[PDB]
């Protein structure tokens, strides 16, 4: 039930990760001779780039945009072990305030933080190495302050947030291998390894959790040679279950993203085929629509 | 060339437009005060104003800096501010502390603030200086000038926190300036001892840069005096003269770059005086 | 500019004015004190949020003296067409007091 298209914009080389803003206006292409394409939304629909200069030494690996309600901000890693935080100031430049070194290995990950949390920024490195940093000032950002860390004792490829945003809820990071969950308590104020769900021994690209949108069981996906959903149900301790195994893709899945509502789950393999998995009237999982990699 | 068709009573008697040329102003005998709009051109009727204890005299438009506000100084005690608050033209406030007749209502330079000057013919002088709360603060000083004293006039701000300034005269024949000190009292400084027989209209003239402050001099022995400055520090006001026309001269009014002296008299007409390159004073019309 | 002024045409004034050599509350969020600025001091945060679109804003803002609720010129434009209510219903009639 999808239908296709092309988007006019003029790309000379490879791109690795596209990520959009809060709105619906302005993606964050980053990728190959070591770039940064901002790009935008004019109104008439078309795509005009308005942005572009020299990221660190290593190959940009990802790039996360920030909420509206802290300006334009930016989180990027390299392979140079060092995470750059790109905020615009005053127009059409764009001027560093920070630049994180900790990690001894290649970053692997950058993602943001919720809103309700404050302004957050997690990293992680190559060899496992997880740290969490906080900057409390929000009117400086050229203020950076390490908050907790954890020991994955792994090889960390990717990292997923919690987007619960409930009182009555407990913040929590799950870190891809190349699979666990994480519990930051209140007392103590610490990550943790409250649980963690044994059923892909398979090499994990990207993992996603699903927005809350006032359920009481919160969806995670994990991507390997089969695309899998699964679902935890609180009672601290959860009620680990998967319900999901669809493995058409033929490939090796890429990566997973999830909708705005947490319905429509997106999954691209590596056989160029991009594929689309909706719910059913009996809360089923059935494919909606397959897409080719050329168009 | 617009007209305004005169519906008073007795004799007009002056006449003043306002900041951007919208209104009127028209002070009689008959205690008229009735503000014309002249948009577009034509005639309407604002404000019949009423109110006083004589003829009034002299009517000063005040900066709309502060808002619509005219100044009365009809032969009485009375220095009526008329508001005109709230879309509708009202009184707002008099103040009699004056026992003669006043002659003369000339607003102050807008950078200071709003102050008033408005001398008697006792040899007086007063500033209404506006507070900030809707009160005023009058004070005056207990004589200036023999007989009369019926025209002052204000000096352009200049300088770098400021030296205020302003001209009188009338009554001896005479003209005087007072450059009030940092205590607070108007202290006084020379007189300007050149005239003859009895002098009306004390005007000054605007400032644009050039260090040569003018000021005139309309009188009843039909002479008109350009005075003249090199600097303020010299001091050297050397009287020149312009004309000796037979019958009074009334009143002098210069333009907003004073490149014209325009003298109205007893001889019921309009002359437009103007300098040439030689210094001699010659007219246009 | 004094002439510029009183002609009538004044943007020429201030275009004018320009060029001369010499010189010439709202509440916070987070912390709930008076702060003066479009940044706050306490948490450092913005102060100023946006009653239409609840985005922080450090520009140009109209408001009700009375009601206390402020937003973008052009988002006070867009509501206050028409409809006179405030868009975050504290019932002000903010055209009648403002
Ligand atoms: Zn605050
Ligand atoms: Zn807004
Ligand atoms: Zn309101
Ligand atoms: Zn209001």
Same mark, same amino acid.
């Given at each position: ?22 709105? #619906?206006?302005?993606? +964050? %292409? *980053? @990728?190959? =001779?070591?770039? /940064? ?80 949390? #404050?302004?957050?920024? +997690? %990293? *992680? @490195?190559? =060899?496992?190495? /997880? ?165 | ?285 | ?98």
């Amino acid at each position: 039930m999808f239908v296709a298209r092309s988007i006019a914009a003029d790309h000379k080389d490879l791109i690795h990760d596209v990520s959009f803003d809060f709105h #619906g206006r302005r993606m +964050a %292409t *980053c @990728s190959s =001779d070591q770039s /940064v394409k901002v790009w935008d939304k004019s109104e008439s629909g078309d795509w005009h780039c308005t942005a572009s200069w020299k990221t660190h030494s290593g190959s940009v690996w990802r790039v996360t945009w920030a909420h509206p309600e802290f300006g334009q901000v930016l989180a990027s890693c390299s392979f140079d072990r060092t995470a750059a935080v790109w905020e615009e100031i005053v127009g059409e430049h764009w001027v560093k305030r920070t630049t994180l070194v900790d990690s001894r290995t290649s970053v692997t990950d950058v993602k943001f933080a919720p809103k309700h949390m #404050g302004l957050m920024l +997690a %990293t *992680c @490195s190559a =060899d496992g190495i /997880v740290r969490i940093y906080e900057a409390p000032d929000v009117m400086n950002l050229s203020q950076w302050s390490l908050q907790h860390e954890i020991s994955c004792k792994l090889s960390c490829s990717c990292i997923s947030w919690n987007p619960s945003s409930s009182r009555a809820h407990s913040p929590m990071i799950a870190v891809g291998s190349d699979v666990q969950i994480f519990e930051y308590n209140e007392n103590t104020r610490k990550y943790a390894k409250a649980e963690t769900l044994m059923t892909v021994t398979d090499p994990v690209h990207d993992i996603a959790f699903a927005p809350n949108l006032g359920r009481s069981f919160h969806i995670l996906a994990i991507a390997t040679k089969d695309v899998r959903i699964f679902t935890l149900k609180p009672v601290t301790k959860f009620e680990i279950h998967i319900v999901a195994q669809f493995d058409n893709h033929n490939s090796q899945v890429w990566r997973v993203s999830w909708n705005i509502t947490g319905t429509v789950l997106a999954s691209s393999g590596d056989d160029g085929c991009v594929r689309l998995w909706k719910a059913n009237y009996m809360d089923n999982w059935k494919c909606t629509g397959i897409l080719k990699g050329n168009g | 060339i617009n007209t305004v068709d005169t519906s008073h009573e007795d004799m007009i008697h002056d006449a003043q437009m306002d900041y951007y040329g919208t209104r009127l102003a028209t002070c009689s005998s008959d205690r008229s005060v009735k503000i014309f709009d002249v948009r577009n051109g034509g005639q309407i009727l604002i404000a019949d104003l009423r109110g006083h204890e004589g003829p009034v005299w002299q009517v000063a438009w005040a900066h709309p800096m502060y808002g619509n506000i005219l100044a009365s100084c009809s032969y009485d005690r009375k220095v009526i501010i008329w508001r005109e608050e709230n879309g509708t033209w009202e009184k707002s406030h008099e103040h009699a502390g004056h026992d003669s007749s006043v002659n003369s209502v000339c607003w102050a330079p807008h950078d200071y603030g709003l102050i008033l000057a408005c001398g008697s013919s006792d040899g007086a002088i007063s500033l209404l200086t506006y507070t900030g709360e809707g009160q005023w603060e009058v004070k005056k000083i207990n004589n200036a000038h023999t007989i009369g004293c019926n025209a002052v006039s204000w000096a352009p701000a200049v300088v770098p926190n400021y030296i205020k300034r302003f001209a009188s005269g009338g009554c001896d024949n005479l003209i005087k300036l007072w450059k009030e000190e940092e205590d607070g009292q108007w202290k006084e400084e020379q007189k300007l001892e050149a005239h003859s027989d009895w002098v009306r209209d004390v005007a000054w003239a605007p400032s644009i840069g050039l260090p040569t402050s003018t000021i005139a001099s309309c009188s009843q022995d039909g002479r008109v005096f350009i005075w003249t400055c090199d600097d303020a520090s010299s001091n050297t006001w050397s009287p020149k003269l312009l004309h000796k026309f037979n019958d009074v001269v009334w009143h002098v009014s210069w333009s907003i770059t004073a490149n014209i002296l325009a003298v109205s008299g007893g001889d019921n007409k309009v002359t437009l005086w103007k300098e040439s390159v030689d210094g001699q004073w010659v007219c246009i019309s | 500019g004094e002439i510029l002024y009183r002609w009538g045409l004044r943007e020429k004034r201030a275009e004018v004015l320009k060029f001369v050599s010499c010189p010439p509350g709202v509440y916070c969020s987070h912390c709930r004190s008076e702060v003066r600025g479009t940044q706050c001091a306490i948490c450092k945060g913005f102060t100023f949020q946006c009653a239409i679109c609840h985005v922080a804003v450090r520009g140009s803002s109209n408001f009700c003296l009375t009601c206390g609720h402020g937003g973008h010129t052009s988002h006070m434009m867009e509501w206050f067409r028409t409809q006179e209510v405030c868009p975050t219903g504290c019932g002000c009639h903010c055209l009648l007091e403002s």
